Amino acid sequence: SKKILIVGAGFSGAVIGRQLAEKGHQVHIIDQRDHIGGNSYDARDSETNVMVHVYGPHIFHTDNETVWNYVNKHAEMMPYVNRVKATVNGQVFSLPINLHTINQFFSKTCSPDEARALIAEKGDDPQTFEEEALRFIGKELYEAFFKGYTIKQWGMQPSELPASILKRLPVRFNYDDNYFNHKFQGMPKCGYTQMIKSILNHENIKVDLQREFIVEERTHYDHVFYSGPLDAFYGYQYGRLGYRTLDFKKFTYQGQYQGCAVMNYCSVDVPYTRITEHKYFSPWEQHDGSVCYKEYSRACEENDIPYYPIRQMGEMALLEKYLSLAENETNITFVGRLGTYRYLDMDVTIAEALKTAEVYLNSLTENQPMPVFTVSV
Numbered sequence: 001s002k003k004i005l006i007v008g009a010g011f012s013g014a015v016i017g018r019q020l021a022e023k024g025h026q027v028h029i030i031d032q033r034d035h036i037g038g039n040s041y042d043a044r045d046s047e048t049n050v051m052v053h054v055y056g057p058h059i060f061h062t063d064n065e066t067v068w069n070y071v072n073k074h075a076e077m078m079p080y081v082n083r084v085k086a087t088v089n090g091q092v093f094s095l096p097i098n099l100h101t102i103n104q105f106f107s108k109t110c111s112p113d114e115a116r117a118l119i120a121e122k123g124d125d126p127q128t129f130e131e132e133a134l135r136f137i138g139k140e141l142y143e144a145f146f147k148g149y150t151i152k153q154w155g156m157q158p159s160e161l162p163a164s165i166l167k168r169l170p171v172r173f174n175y176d177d178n179y180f181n182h183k184f185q186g187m188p189k190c191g192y193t194q195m196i197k198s199i200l201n202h203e204n205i206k207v208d209l210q211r212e213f214i215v216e217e218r219t220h221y222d223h224v225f226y227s228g229p230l231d232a233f234y235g236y237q238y239g240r241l242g243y244r245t246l247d248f249k250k251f252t253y254q255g256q257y258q259g260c261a262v263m264n265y266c267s268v269d270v271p272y273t274r275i276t277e278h279k280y281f282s283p284w285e286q287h288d289g290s291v292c293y294k295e296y297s298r299a300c301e302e303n304d305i306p307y308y309p310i311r312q313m314g315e316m317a318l319l320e321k322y323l324s325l326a327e328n329e330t331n332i333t334f335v336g337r338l339g340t341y342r343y344l345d346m347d348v349t350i351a352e353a354l355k356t357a358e359v360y361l362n363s364l365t366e367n368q369p370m371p372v373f374t375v376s377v
């Protein structure tokens with residue numbers, strides 16, 4: 001029976017914790033926040049009865065059946081297919097770019113094959129160096145849907161990012177407006193917080209909230225699983241890792257503010273990146289009042305929640321410093337979106353957390369040392 005400290009009550013910590021707890025280990029899970037869930041956390045607005053996704057829209061989607069089966073054990077999963085609109089050029093469009101977006105954009109009536117001909121004769125360019133340089137789609141579409149969105153979202157010009165990150169033509173030549181191509185797509189009936197609470201619901205798990213990790217503690221345990229920022233663990237001794245932060249400005253509207261869950265504003269002339277109307281993530285509930293967030297993207301200064309990691313040369317170079325400090329550590333595994341500096345989806349989080357616990361469990365049945373990283377960086 002091993003004594004485990006987990007730093008974080010998000011999917012990583014909850015899922016590693018419950019796998020271990022079930023093989024009889026004594027798991028202690030701590031979180032600096034006053035609530036479990038991590039960034040997947042949702043709460044019901046008190047004035048409105050609206051399930052608010054507190055750290056932004058969280059839509060569940062996976063091609064992994066084992067991950068799907070696992071979340072259904074812990075929540076009632078509701079069919080929910082996310083559909084995004086975008087406002088730009090004084091018009092409202094379906095996202096991703098599809099047959100309707102094209103026909104509406106160019107005031108046309110193209111069939112799919114006619115639209116393929118349009119996009120080819122609208123594309124521009126020998127050997128492409130920039131993301132700006134992807135005239136897959138041409139100038140009007142790059143500018144409408146891609147340029148101002150990158151500037152607001154990444155605080156960068158698309159001529160500044162590499163040609164990668166846009167591997168394929170970003171258009172779908174039919175009227176399917178599902179945003180996500182994943183096989184399994186749903187929404188927990190009662191939210192992610194109730195889901196993760198269920199996950200944490202084992203006698204071998206003790207949860208302590210409003211509690212920050214303190215390094216000296218590490219010596220009271222057989223192993224630590226750490227889902228906190230990898231640079232923060234080292235006190236940012238080499239400097240902070242590049243992140244974008246988000247500000248959410250909350251407002252309550254009486255009625256329906258926008259008529260969909262998520263509306264993107266592609267233009268630089270709109271300072272928020274998108275508006276989320278949370279009641280739309282629970283279509284099986286009726287709400288008179290509505291909680292909405294205007295979302296603002298910005299450089300992660302000090303005291304900000306890290307959201308989206310910027311991952312270019314400068315950052316990876318700085319990461320490499322922490323990476324070789326860390327690969328020298330003896331009884332710790334860094335896991336999750338922050339412990340590893342990657343953007344991970346919820347389903348990919350749980351996947352990696354089931355595998356992490358499985359690796360650790362194996363390491364005991366055997367002879368063998370538990371690695372500091374369970375996935376490559």
Ligand SMILES: Cc1cc2nc3c(=O)[nH]c(=O)nc-3n(C[C@H](O)[C@H](O)[C@H](O)COP(=O)(O)OP(=O)(O)OC[C@H]3O[C@@H](n4cnc5c(N)ncnc54)[C@H](O)[C@@H]3O)c2cc1C
Nearest residue numbers: 008010011012031032038039058059213228336344345346
């Ligand atoms: C804006 C945004 C929107 C997203 N929407 C989707 C979506 O629609 N679909 C999808 O699949 N995924 C979505 N995600 C991804 C999802 O949020 C992540 O997969 C999930 O947050 C991973 O959780 P985690 O357990 O690995 O880490 P986290 O959720 O960040 O949890 C880490 C926990 O560690 C705690 N912590 C950190 N350091 C310490 C410390 N030193 N001491 C104590 N506690 C500490 C924090 O308080 C936090 O609660 C989104 C991500 C972002 C940023």
